[PDB]
């Protein structure tokens, strides 16, 4: 048995590789003297799917090495498509035909000619048959499958599909015998990542470049989610800094330094700033109780087995920093996965482009264990305007089924809307689908206002005595982003006129 992962090449997926070894490839390592009786035809094809950067292409070449082909030819689907119909199918035929020569020539004792597709999922979209809308590329898949299971079948072959879209694949392509068996790869657990670090480190470990103050057992877990593809780049940076250390002129961790640089597949820390410019200024009880509620129901998911999915929206009047509050609710618990979906990046897109950007984010999130996702300015991506009712029906439909769609068993997430007006949503029946709501009252009172202004510290005791004189009495209704706006607008003034400029503008807010 040659299938042990103490061999260095790959790791972390040991159960999944074990399964394919168990039922897929057992026939090919066995004494043939037995199996020649049973006439068991080997699996011609296999599929393995998962996220991109999780180390599948070193699985494939490594199984070829395990059971030796002449060699793999690896291809990407989009690397072959041609406008001219003949070329694409011809390319595929060339790929298979490399084997057929040996098969017919040397009969049935030939070694495997192995094929790998990097992504089929573009070429193998599921065709459907009617006079219109047959499809653009619907005739390449026919050539592929006619080679796989066709007339004058060949036993000289093995083919590994790789994809990130397992649901778009045709249903006959993966029927038993054409590709019989499917496996899932998922982004590795901490055990797998400490293995991975052992792998990519093993040369440095042998050469003893990095001798001190370095522990993989802790350094694996301090990053809760990364991609095995990304870890080799991380290790490269840790090796690169010792060489960038001698720009000044035996090895150190730089991981704690560079992890902030690294964008993950998972959580990012560099998108906060735009939503949080200034951080969270607690002006009164409502702020802290709101984010206390966020910290309250985050525990709900992580400790609940019967509510994998949960959702809220922060309603309130405009310019109350609901986006920032959602961002802070995300940041407080150090989630594995946080991500924004927003019109800032979905700008200038069609109603079916922003849906397919949003579904990408969510199906990305489904495959992490625990997650928090946030949607800001619902009205914007919903493309609402009051004059006329106008919106994209597609988007809200596709948004709320996602709010009602549970992820696979054992994975959980919460969803956070920032919608600023909910009357539309109550009439348009998204509010029964949201679990519950949060009112974010903007500041209602001057006794809290001057407190907030003290926390910011723009104005002196005299300038603030002015305010304390002018309004105790009014209940001012003001969004704080507007507060920032007009304090900065009055900050440029003749200093003598500064304060009453601010006051006069503030008294134009309405209500």
């Amino acid at each position: 048995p040659d299938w042990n992962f103490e061999k260095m090449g790959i790791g972390g997926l040991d159960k999944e590789f074990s399964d394919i070894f168990r039922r897929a490839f057992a026939s090919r390592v066995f004494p043939p003297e037995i199996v020649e009786q049973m006439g068991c035809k080997h699996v011609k094809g296999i599929l393995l799917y998962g996220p991109p950067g999780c180390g599948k292409t070193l699985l494939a070449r490594q199984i070829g090495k395990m059971l030796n082909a002449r060699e793999p030819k690896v291809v990407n689907g989009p690397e072959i498509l041609n406008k001219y119909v003949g070329e694409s199918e011809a390319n595929i035929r060339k790929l298979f035909a490399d084997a057929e020569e040996e098969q017919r020539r040397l009969g049935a004792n030939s070694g495997l000619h192995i094929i790998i597709f990097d992504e089929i999922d573009a070429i193998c979209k599921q065709r459907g048959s009617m006079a219109g809308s047959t499809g653009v590329h619907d005739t390449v898949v026919n050539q592929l499958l006619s080679k796989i299971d066709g007339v004058e079948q060949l036993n000289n072959i093995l083919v590994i599909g790789m994809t990130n879209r397992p649901d778009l694949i045709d249903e006959a392509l993966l029927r038993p015998g054409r590709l019989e068996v499917k496996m899932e790869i998922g982004l590795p657990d901490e055990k797998g990542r400490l293995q991975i670090l052992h792998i990519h480190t093993a040369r440095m470990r042998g050469h003893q470049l990095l001798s001190a103050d370095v522990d993989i057992k802790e350094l694996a877990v301090e990053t809760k989610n990364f991609s095995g593809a990304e870890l080799e780049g991380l290790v490269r940076a840790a090796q690169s800094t010792a060489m960038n250390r001698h720009i000044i002129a035996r090895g150190d961790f730089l991981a704690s330094l560079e992890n902030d640089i690294k964008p993950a597949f998972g959580t990012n820390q560099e998108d906060y700033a735009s939503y949080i410019m200034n951080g969270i200024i607690k002006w009164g009880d409502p702020v802290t109780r709101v984010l206390d509620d966020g910290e309250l129901l985050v525990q709900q998911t992580k400790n609940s087995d019967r509510t994998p999915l949960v959702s809220v929206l922060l309603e309130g009047p405009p310019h109350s920093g609901k986006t920032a509050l959602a961002a802070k609710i995300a940041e407080e618990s150090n989630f594995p996965f946080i991500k924004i979906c927003s019109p800032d990046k979905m700008i200038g897109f069609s109603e079916t482009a922003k849906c397919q950007a949003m579904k990408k984010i969510f199906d990305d999130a489904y495959k992490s264990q625990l997650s928090c996702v946030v949607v800001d300015d619902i009205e914007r991506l919903l493309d609402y305007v009051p004059i006329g009712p106008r919106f994209s029906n597609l988007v809200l439909q596709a948004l709320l089924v996602l709010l009602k769609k549970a992820p696979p068993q054992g994975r959980k997430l919460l969803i956070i809307g920032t919608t600023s007006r909910k009357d539309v949503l109550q009439e348009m029946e998204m509010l029964n689908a949201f679990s519950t709501t949060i009112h974010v009252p903007n500041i209602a009172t001057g006794e809290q206002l001057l407190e907030a202004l003290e926390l910011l510290g723009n104005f002196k005791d005299k300038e603030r005595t002015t305010i304390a004189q002018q309004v105790k009495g009014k209940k001012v209704w003001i969004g704080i982003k507007k507060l920032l706006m007009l304090i900065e607008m009055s900050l440029q003034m003749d200093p003598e006129y500064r304060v009453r400029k601010f006051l006069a503008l503030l008294r134009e807010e309405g209500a």
Partner: peptide, 17 residues
């Protein structure tokens, strides 16, 4: 796509004199 281009091409004669 929905693309059909069917095309032709021309010969460059070899010198055998």
């Amino acid at each position: 796509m929905a693309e059909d281009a069917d095309m032709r091409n021309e010969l460059e004669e070899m010198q055998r004199r």
